[PDB]
């Protein structure tokens, strides 16, 4: 990484994160760094343990994509930009063949 | 400062409490989970609320009562309220030779009477420490020799320092008069004052 | 309904209430004068 | 000006009490793109038969208002199902199912004295169209009160083709994108991601990276 | 703990319910379909609600009552009550030798008295399992010799583990007070506490 | 399931309907234009609302009624309500040899009685089909030979399949008990239960 | 259609208005100027409102009444009513040979009886044109031989076309029900439907 | 136009004012500063509000009153209201030879009676100018020879042009009938009309 | 100005307070601390509020009263009132030769009569300084020969400048009307104005 | 609370009320299409 | 009035209600981090 | 997952009425950076001793809700003092005093 120190501290931290997941948390006193992961022993919540309210919301539009196109500064080239593009046949077999591309950098 | 009652001032019989209302005010955050379990949370303090009602008042009775209330509002003192129904004398003797071990911050007083007190307090009576103005009600009492085990409704508002002395008789509520922002009394054409009510709150 | 008139009589409060949730992150509404 | 039959222009002017029903026809969210199942629903108290299709009742609760300005914008509509059907609940909350590009057509039907559909649209000689678009969103709202009556509402979200305004559909000059390359077992093989099946053997953009 | 009543404390006949309101509180996700069909889903747990009204209480009886209530508020446990209208001892015998086969959920229940109990529990009477504190209500009864088939209005909260024993007499509701936050008592010039009432609510 | 009434259960005379309230619930969207023309729009269905009031209930009457209501709430059945004022027997005979032509979805039933039915239905009576639980009121009736022209208030909730059979006598409302979320009854000190009301709604 | 009343159905004397409220409903853009002047602009159309209250209705009379009302709700037409206090037949004769010259707008109207009518319509009586269903109210009358000059409170909704005939008797209000959405009837133990009332409202 | 009263129309004794309510409506912006000083601001005008109540009305009395009110609502005129309690004749003579100097815009009228008027007006009477319809009350009156110094409650709504003539007797309120948007009267079964109220406002 | 009353105008005995409500209005920043202590800060000025109720007023008495009130509303000055219950002339003499030493703030006040006054002002009586229009209330009195020590409920609004003279008799409250905006008077058929009342409020 | 649903049913009024306080100065919300 | 305090206690709802009317067209409030 | 002692996991599961107190410890706004004075406060009705520190009562009135998303943002909290203490008022409204970087632990 290169951190342009002329940027703000808040924006620099926000840019260091979102590159590996990450979420700075100030709860319970300390600063805790948490990244996305899968566990074989998660905490079991039944709906009867809740307060009775429940809101389900799935925004498949504007958030579900079938293919990704990314770019990066690759030292294989003379530190120029290289594009990584690939599709998924299963995700396009689903969604009735709609063409939706995820753009990343 | 004592609120005028027909104990100290029997010449004004209209100053008696036509009906008192000892209100238990203990605000709590109560939440009912869908699984049928009701859960409570207590943070704030409990304060005894006293509501006094009065009959028609003659000019002299109202003059005395109003002079006392205006003296209260002038000096900013604390009205003391005496409830006759709580003045049953059970424990008699000296409360200076009794010792209370220090460090008691729960909801229970353990005191060694040292055999200097006759009688035993009854459950539901009024109990108070000598160094704090908060008034307690005895919910349970077990005596094993000279050491007494008095249980109180409000959790001890102070941590005993070992110098406190229990007070069983002559207990007064260190109240502060609420509803004094708009306090008035209408004088009828027959010369008697009507519509006088004292909403008092225990300002320890 | 008749809520439009009311909101039009309390616009500055709406602006402040909006800018108070954008300051949670580093966003703020004073960045529109550039554009 | 959507023209209306003169026959309907008399009924809409003489009769005051109009019995209107909205016929909903949404595509089932399915895990794969195979086949095309449709659920037919109505807001009327009894089932309504239109073109031989029985629009069953008892599920739809409310429909939102379709608004269109003179500035390009997504046309959002929201119709709610009861949410206690327990057969519509599983379709929405099913795992591994996507409804990214499932359509929905809603008709505005007027019932006569005899219980039939009053013809309005001249081209079809049937009822008008209220909305036709795509399903983009959804949700269910459970509210269990510990004392009283609880409610549950399943709301489906709808919009037109421009729902994803941050969408760049273009043929970027690259072999990997033009032929839709994807690793299948150990090689980058062209797939159906190409805009045309004849793009799978097009090597036109092969040397575009070093040009 | 036990709520005082003339059965536990016969010396205080002023205690005792002037009127008891046993309400049924089953929250439900009711939905009124446009076609006329009403669909309701039961998710939240059901709980009996008890509203107790007291007659004119003399000062000593109220002292005992509020002492017990303040002990409740202090130690924070549950407050058991015994409704007397359901105290018709219609089933004699000792229920220890009565076995309830394990693995039973729902309204229906099967228990084998093994020729021990005498008396038939008619519909409308109360029922309670030995372990769980929930209180049910028998809606229908049918027996084939020793085996008894009982249908209860609330579904069995916990599945029988083969050791739960029936309790056909002396059933106590594990309740919690709902008037605690602001609970006042008025004293008349006649010398009685008037309008004392409780809004209880079964917990779990 | 039938609601207990003094037809099936005359031994409990307190179970009679002290006052019934047949509520016509047909929600409509009514808009009044400034040109003086009031316009209505109907989408939702019409459901008959029944409200039952009861007098003071003795312990046995209340026990029976409460057992029936708890059985209802346990099995989730449908309470059937019988109104005596609508039990005038006019049409008598067999309703199996009568034929109803299919495809009738309006607000009018044309049926060929085939001369098997004696008498004629009167306007304002209660009419119901044998294959649907919705209850209809006859608003008009014209007989031209054997074919009858019965006009009904609620628009036909079903399209006749040709197998439906008209029902004129013995009509019950397939109601579902509303206000059952908080259902209770206070027991007075004199032993009688008071404050019992059934708000029923026709859940077809 | 016609609302049943003792004139149409004398066999049902229970029908008939116990009390009728004929309200005047003219919406207006009233504005209270700061100088004390009140300015009001009439834009929305005026409509008479009729509130009918019925006496104790026996079951058969209520059956007829609600049968007619449900036929109204079914076929969706208008519901005509005849107020009996305005049924004083003060104008004899046949009004077919009475001509109203065309091109008349506003409150004033001129009609030529051609020496046919006998009787003078005094102020406060009703008036209605043959074609339009609006009902006016005569406020002043002045006749010069055969020609009659009548001033009506609501301005003529439609300009006379030279064929409209006066209707001085049997005037019916073309009304619409406003209690239809929730219309319930209670049956007493005495056997009568009590508190039946209608909130009608003239349409157009 | 004059409102019917038992002065002009004594044949209808039911048209008398059972109770009048002269309401002083002078809207002001009143602000109370924390320093105990209450401050007022007056911008809008003051208008006399008159409320009339009526007893049960026979058909002829109601017919006359309703005809007059409908004539008012037809021509859009101004109802004139006469209060008998303000009809004491003190100042008598000619009001045409009296001169009022111009330029008087305050709250005080200085007029030279020129010795043509006998008697003197009393404080609290009703006073009005001949060129404006607003009604004034005399709050003070000092006479120094022929020039009178009349003080009025409402600030002069007009600036005197020198041609105005004072009016002391026969003063009417140029009111406009409020609550006419929904104006009605229920006719009871005994033939008398009830529930008639006139809320009038001075629309100068 | 002076509010009319039987002392100023004995010819009108209808004037005079049927009932007077002298309310105390001290705004305060009261705060209820979580520990049970109640903290209140006095910032806003205190002001006596006077609610006057009049008996049945005959037309001439009401004419005088509302003439005076409208003169008040016109000239905009303050409206003085004299409460008669505090008119007990308990202090004889002329107070001009009574000096109040300068530089005194707070409730306490010291004044030297120089052997002039006769009579002791008991607690509850009124007190007012010559210059400032505020009205206080004596709460306690103590005299050592000629010097008098008086404690007043409201703190001295202005510090004594050495020239203020005591006013123990004829104390007038400088009040402002609070019912002016909508002040109506009803005239009965008996001939009296009923329910005339005033909500006064001391200004400054 | 249940205020979220309501506001979600009156969004355009909120937008207008916001843009009415930004027009006090030279800011406006139509300058977001560029970004 | 006392509406300011309330709105300051529900700011996120205001933000969402605003962003829900800008998404009608292609505008959104997440385009302020650039500026 | 902030681990909790199993002993507390029994109390939080068996007891229903929980008596909770929030112990506040804020640094005094001082004109200079010299020294570090602390005011210790509590929301409980009686003073609570923790690690020998007496958290006096009677001042704190309410505390806000601490919310944390998965997007970087300032974690705002708001606790209110009575405002009629007249000893906390002067500390806030004092002239020439800055509290730019004064901490607080709750």
Curated annotation (Swiss-Prot), chains B, E, F, G, H, I:
Protein's cellular compartments: Virion
Keywords in alphabetical order: Late protein, Viral tail protein, Virion
Gene3D superfamilies: 2.40.30.290, 3.30.200.190
Cellular component aspect of the GO annotation: virus tail; virus tail, baseplate
Main location: virion
Transmembrane spans: none
Protein task: Forms the simplified baseplate, together with the p132 collar protein, the baseplate tube protein p140 and baseplate hub protein pb3.
Domain notes: Possesses OB-fold domains probably serving host adhesion properties.
Binding partners and assembly: Homohexamer. Interacts with baseplate tube protein p140 and baseplate hub protein pb3.
Protein name: Distal tail protein pb9
Encoding gene, per UniProt annotation: D16
Curated annotation (Swiss-Prot), chains C, J, K:
Reported function: Displays an exolysin activity that is probably involved in the fusion with the host membrane and in the host peptidoglycan digestion necessary for viral DNA entry into the host cell.
Subcellular location: Virion
Record's catalysed reaction(s): Exolytic cleavage of the (1->4)-beta-glycosidic linkage between N-acetylmuramic acid (MurNAc) and N-acetylglucosamine (GlcNAc) residues in peptidoglycan, from either the reducing or the non-reducing ends of the peptidoglycan chains, with concomitant formation of a 1,6-anhydrobond in the MurNAc residue
Protein name listed in UniProt: Exolysin
Residues of the full protein shown: 1185 to 1219 of 1219
Top-level taxon of origin: Viruses
Swiss-Prot record, chain D:
Protein name, per record: Baseplate hub protein pb3
Known partners and oligomeric status: Homotrimer. Forms a pseudo-hexameric ring. Interacts with distal tail protein pb9 and straight fiber protein pb4.
Compartment annotation: Virion
Shown segment, full-protein numbering: 1 to 211 of 949
Cited function: Forms the simplified baseplate, together with the p132 collar protein, the baseplate tube protein p140 and distal tail protein pb9. Closes the tail tube and, upon infection, opens to form a channel thereby anchoring the tube to the outer membrane. These changes allow the tape measure protein pb2 to be expelled and phage DNA to be transferred to the host. Also forms the start of the central straight fiber, which is continued with the straight fiber protein pb4.
Signals that turn on the gene: Expressed in the late phase of the viral replicative cycle.
Post-translational modification: Ubiquitinated by the Bil antiviral defense system when this protein is expressed in E.coli MG1655 strain expressing the Bil system.
UniProtKB/Swiss-Prot annotation, chain L:
Domain of life from the UniProt record: Viruses
Record PTM text: Ubiquitinated by the Bil antiviral defense system when this protein is expressed in E.coli MG1655 strain expressing the Bil system.
Induction of the gene: Expressed in the late phase of the viral replicative cycle.
Cell location: Virion
Subunit structure: Homotrimer. Forms a pseudo-hexameric ring. Interacts with distal tail protein pb9 and straight fiber protein pb4.
Function, in words: Forms the simplified baseplate, together with the p132 collar protein, the baseplate tube protein p140 and distal tail protein pb9. Closes the tail tube and, upon infection, opens to form a channel thereby anchoring the tube to the outer membrane. These changes allow the tape measure protein pb2 to be expelled and phage DNA to be transferred to the host. Also forms the start of the central straight fiber, which is continued with the straight fiber protein pb4.
Name recorded for this polypeptide: Baseplate hub protein pb3
Organism this protein belongs to: Escherichia phage T5 (Enterobacteria phage T5)
Upper classification of the organism: Viruses, Duplodnaviria, Heunggongvirae, Uroviricota, Caudoviricetes
Interval of the full protein contained in this chain: 1 to 106 of 949
């Amino acid at each position: 990484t290169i951190l342009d120190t002329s940027e703000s501290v808040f924006k620099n931290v926000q840019g260091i994160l979102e590159s590996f997941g990450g979420a700075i948390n100030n709860l319970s006193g300390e600063y805790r760094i948490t990244v996305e992961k899968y566990s074989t022993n998660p905490l079991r919540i039944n709906f009867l343990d809740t307060y009775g309210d429940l809101d389900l919301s799935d925004t498949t539009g504007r958030n579900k994509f079938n293919s990704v196109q990314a770019s990066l500064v690759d030292p294989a080239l003379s530190w120029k930009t290289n594009s990584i593009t690939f599709y998924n046949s299963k995700f396009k077999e689903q969604d009735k063949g709609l063409d939706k591309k995820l753009q990343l950098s | 400062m004592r609120l005028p009652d027909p104990y100290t001032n029997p010449e004004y019989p209209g100053l008696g409490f036509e009906s008192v209302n000892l209100v238990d005010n203990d605000p709590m955050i109560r939440d009912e989970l869908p699984n049928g379990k009701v859960k409570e949370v207590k943070i704030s303090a409990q304060y005894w609320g006293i509501n006094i009602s009065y009959p028609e008042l003659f000019p002299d009775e109202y003059a005395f009562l109003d002079s006392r209330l205006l003296e209260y509002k002038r000096t900013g003192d604390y009205l003391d309220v005496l409830l006759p129904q709580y003045e049953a004398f059970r424990v008699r003797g000296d409360t200076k030779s009794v010792t209370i071990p220090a460090g008691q911050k729960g909801s229970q007083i353990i005191l060694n009477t040292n055999g200097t007190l006759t009688g035993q307090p009854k459950a539901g009576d009024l109990f108070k420490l000598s160094t704090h103005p908060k008034v307690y009600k005895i919910t349970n009492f077990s005596s094993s020799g000279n050491v007494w085990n008095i249980s109180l409704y409000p959790d001890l508002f102070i941590t005993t320092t070992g110098s406190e002395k229990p007070v069983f008789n002559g207990i007064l509520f260190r109240t502060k008069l609420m509803n004094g922002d708009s306090f008035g009394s209408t004088l009828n054409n027959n010369g008697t004052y009507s519509g006088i009510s004292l909403s008092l709150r225990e300002s320890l | 309904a008749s809520f439009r008139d009311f909101a039009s009589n309390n616009s500055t409060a709406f602006r402040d209430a909006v800018e108070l949730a954008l300051n949670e992150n580093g966003t703020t509404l004073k960045s529109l004068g550039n554009s | 000006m959507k023209k209306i039959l003169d026959s309907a222009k008399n009924y809409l002017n003489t009769h005051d009490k109009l019995k209107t029903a909205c016929l909903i026809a949404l595509e089932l969210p399915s895990s794969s793109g195979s086949a095309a199942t449709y659920i037919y629903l109505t807001d009327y108290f009894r089932d309504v038969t239109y073109n031989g299709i029985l629009y069953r009742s008892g599920k739809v609760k409310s429909i939102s208002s379709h608004k269109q300005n003179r500035q390009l914008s997504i046309g959002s509509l929201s119709f709610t199902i009861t949410g206690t059907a327990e057969d519509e609940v599983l379709k929405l909350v099913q795992n591994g199912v996507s409804f990214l590009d499932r359509g929905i057509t809603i008709h505005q039907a007027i019932i006569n004295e005899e219980g039939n559909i009053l013809p309005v649209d001249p081209d079809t000689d049937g009822p008008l169209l209220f909305f036709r678009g795509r399903i983009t969103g959804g949700g269910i709202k459970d509210n269990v009160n510990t004392s009283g009556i609880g409610t549950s509402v399943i709301t489906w979200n709808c919009s037109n083709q421009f729902y994803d305004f941050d969408r760049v559909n273009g043929r970027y000059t690259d072999d990997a994108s033009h032929r839709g390359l994807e690793v299948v077992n150990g090689t980058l093989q062209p797939s159906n991601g190409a805009k045309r099946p004849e793009y799978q053997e097009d090597y036109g953009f092969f040397h575009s990276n070093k040009s």
